[PDB]
Amino acid sequence: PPVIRQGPVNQTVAVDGTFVLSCVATGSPVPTILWRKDGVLVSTQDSRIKQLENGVLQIRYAKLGDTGRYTCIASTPSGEATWSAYIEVQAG
């Protein structure tokens, strides 16, 4: 089964700022990382949301609606692992 060693860390983000959510997973085969925001897979087609590397998710110019829980999903045919962090976004 895939094992998540370092998971996303909770953070307070200001509106229009930039936040990064990283994730490190171990296993044979090499686990694939997927991101879920409030039970819905993070879009691969948003100009501001970039899935940099397998395990790193960057969100530039943060909206108020970006508030929620982000889940890091490590996938291989031998199982699946999850790690969650809540990201809150308030105005100035």
Author numbering: 454 to 545
From the paper:
Roundabout (Robo) receptors provide an essential repulsive cue in neuronal development following Slit ligand binding. The Drosophila and vertebrate Robo1-3 are most similar, containing five immunoglobulin (Ig) and three fibronectin (Fn) domains in their extracellular region. Here we present the crystal structure of Robo1 Ig1-4 and Robo1 Ig5, together with a negative stain electron microscopy reconstruction of the Robo1 ectodomain. These results show how the Robo1 ectodomain is arranged as compact dimers, mainly mediated by the central Ig domains, which can further interact in a “back-to-back” fashion to generate a tetrameric assembly.
An inspection of the potential N-glycosylation site at N463 reveals no additional density. All five Robo1 Ig domains are very similar, the main conformational difference occurring in the βC-βD loop region. Interestingly, the βE-βF loop region in Ig1, which contributes two sequence conserved basic residues (K137 and R136) required for heparin binding (Fukuhara et al., 2008), is longer than those observed in the other four Ig domains. Rigid body modeling of the Robo1 Ig1-5 construct by adding the Ig5 domain determined allowed us to fit the corresponding SAXS data rather well (χ2 = 1.3), yielding a model similar to the previously computed ab initio shape. The Robo1 Ig1-5 has a Dmax of ∼200 Å, indicating that Robo1 Ig1-5 does not adopt an extended conformation and consistent with the EM map having a largest dimension of ∼190 Å. This constraint, including an eight-amino acid linker region between Ig4 and Ig5, provided the basis to model Ig5 in a looping back orientation. The flexible linker regions between Ig4-5 and Ig5-Fn1 enable these domains to loop back toward the N terminus before extending down to the cell surface via Fn2-3.
